[PDB]
Design a protein around this ligand. Structure first.
Ligand SMILES: OC[C@H]1O[C@@H](O[C@H]2[C@H](O)[C@H](O)[C@H](O[C@H]3[C@H](O)[C@H](O)[C@H](O)O[C@@H]3CO)O[C@@H]2CO)[C@@H](O)[C@@H](O)[C@@H]1O
Length: 563
């Protein structure tokens, strides 16, 4: 109990970040206090709350959180954080309406005594921010912002840094954002992760790693990027003898290391673990929930591959239902909630729970992965909620960077997924050893520039069907979407798309290859789009439903508009 206090409860100071701010922007209150509590991360010991009310009478109950300021530096090849001042408590709020808000601070400690502040008034003006990310009511395949504009996630996993810590995100994130990226995913466990909250304990959370997560979230805010926070990873509950980067023997949950659990199976039902997990969820909502740059709360990375001694489908299902309900109940902004599985088809008993707002796929497959992606996307339409291909790569023991230094595998997957009806791009692994050093960001820029000017929420897009190729020299295949105004096609050469040794196509391509007939009413306008340079190649007006295919090396995109 490093941070215990044993004084009579009193507020000693309140600092307010700003008295005027914009819609969806951060309003931060700092609270200095003394009190009686053993653990500032446990609301049964000390419960700080901010109670906000807009001019329409809507109320927001915002939990407060314990905070330590740090100043970062780089010591050669590792980040080092120097503490600045004593720790204290914070409230982080974000207004969804404009106008006036009234708020006050309340504190209760373990003695039952409660203290409170004076009522304060702040004023909120309109801003440019689009709001929080939600499921689209117009098309359940897709996400939207509160203002109604679509959110199509384009990006990659960026789940942890090297020892350089936040200094790596200073490099990766601007490159991603300047190349059309608006999405990444970070890990808050296991204990070795950059942002691990349960580093040494499951009862108290790591203030240094929480500060690093603040830093990265703030960088996302400046760059208009949106983050999935993955709370726990399967390694935590996987025994050494089971392989696959196991971590049970080292995890703070295990009794050997101070935690409540004798074996990982007990995670789902142990009363003490459940209590502390809810405290962690409260801490995460308190510290990060304000942010519209939090796209989603993800409970687990690949919960299906915890130890087989520990995976009890009915227990894991109930825990997800209960935790989703709890998290929603305490999150004033109701961020999206999800979970993930290593098994590519997922676990229907869990994926179908209403409390999980969207479903995911992880897939590492080397052969015919285009067809596998399409099949999984078609299959998961049964859930009638969005689908994110949250992890993707070859099944090559991590050798993607040697097999495919030009990123053709990523290229194929991002085009396939977007134009098959997934909510956004397939999300690559290997951000640090592949995407960045091989400078693969240009693939995302080309795709973003192709899709960004179409409102996917309103096109009534369906996976393409009723097509017929007429091509003699080659084997060309298509992944497509057909909507009420646009048809989007990705064509690929089946004999070239899965070979990765040749240099990036430098198109100079005038010849006719063949045609593809679609079930459309002319007249139409046809745009041919170079998927590597990210530019229009040619434009052609047509009076029939038969699209010439111009010459291309590997793959080519086509945008058709019903006129
Ligand atoms: O350096 C941090 C950490 O690395 C751990 O090992 C990583 C691997 O380096 C690799 O990225 C692996 O990726 C997995 C990941 O588990 C994902 O969810 C899915 O399973 O597929 C990808 C590709 O296989 O992830 C592990 C962690 O699970 C480990 O070496 C730690 O000691 C080290 O601190």
């Amino acid at each position: 109990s490093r941070y215990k206090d044993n004084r009579p409860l009193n507020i000693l100071g309140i600092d307010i970040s700003k008295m005027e701010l914009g819609r969806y922007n951060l309003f931060e209150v700092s609270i200095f206090l003394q009190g009686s509590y053993l653990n500032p991360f446990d609301p049964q010991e000390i419960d700080v709350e901010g109670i906000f009310e807009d001019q329409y009478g809507n109320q927001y109950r915002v939990p407060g959180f314990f905070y330590q300021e740090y100043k970062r530096e780089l010591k050669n090849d590792y980040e080092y954080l120097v503490p600045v001042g004593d720790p204290y408590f914070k409230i982080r709020f974000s207004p969804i309406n404009i106008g006036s808000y009234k708020f006050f601070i309340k504190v209760k400690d373990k003695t039952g005594r409660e203290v409170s502040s004076d009522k304060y008034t702040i004023y909120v003006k309109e801003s440019e921010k689009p709001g929080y990310i939600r499921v689209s009511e117009k098309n359940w395949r897709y996400f939207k912002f509160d203002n109604g504009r679509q959110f199509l996630p384009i990006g990659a996993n960026i789940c942890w840094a090297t020892s350089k810590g936040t200094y790596d995100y200073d490099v990766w994130l601007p490159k991603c954002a300047e190349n059309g990226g608006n999405y990444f995913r970070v890990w808050l466990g296991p204990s070795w992760a950059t942002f691990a909250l349960e580093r040494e304990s499951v009862k108290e959370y790591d203030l240094k790693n929480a500060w690093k997560l603040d830093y990265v979230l703030n960088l996302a805010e400046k760059l208009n990027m949106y983050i999935m926070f993955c709370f726990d990873s399967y390694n935590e509950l996987r025994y050494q003898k089971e392989g696959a980067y196991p971590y049970w023997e080292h995890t703070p949950h295990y009794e050997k290391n101070g935690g409540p659990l004798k074996e990982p199976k007990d995670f789902w039902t142990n009363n003490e673990m459940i209590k502390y997990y809810k405290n962690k969820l409260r801490y995460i909502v308190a510290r990060y929930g304000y942010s519209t740059n939090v796209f989603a709360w993800e409970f687990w990375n690949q919960v299906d591959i915890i130890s087989p001694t520990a995976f009890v489908i009915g227990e894991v299902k109930k825990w997800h239902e209960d935790m989703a309900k709890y998290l929603n109940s305490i999150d004033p902004w109701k961020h999206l909630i999800t979970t993930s599985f290593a098994f590519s088809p997922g676990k229907p008993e869990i994926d179908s729970i209403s409390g999980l707002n969207f479903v995911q796929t992880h897939i590492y497959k080397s052969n015919r992965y285009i067809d596998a992606l399409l099949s999984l996307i078609a299959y998961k339409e049964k859930y009638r909620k969005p689908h994110l291909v949250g992890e993707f790569g070859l099944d090559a023991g991590g050798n993607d960077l040697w097999v495919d230094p030009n990123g053709y595998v990523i290229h194929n997957a991002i085009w396939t997924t977007i134009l098959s009806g997934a909510s956004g791009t397939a999300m690559s692994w290997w951000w640090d050893n592949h995407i960045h050093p091989n400078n693969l960001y240009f693939h995302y820029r080309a795709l973003a520039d192709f899709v960004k000017d179409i409102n996917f929420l309103e096109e009534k897009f369906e996976r393409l069907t009723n097509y017929k190729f007429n091509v003699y020299n080659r084997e060309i295949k298509v992944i497509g979407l057909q909507g009420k105004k646009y048809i989007l096609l990705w064509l690929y050469n089946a004999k070239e798309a899965y070979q990765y040794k040749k240099d990036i196509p430098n198109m100079d391509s005038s010849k006719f290859l063949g045609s593809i007939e679609l079930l459309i009413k002319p007249p139409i306008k046809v745009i041919y789009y170079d998927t590597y340079r990210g530019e229009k190649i040619k434009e052609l007006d047509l009076d029939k439903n038969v699209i010439p295919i111009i010459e291309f090396e590997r793959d080519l995109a086509i945008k058709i508009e019903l006129l």
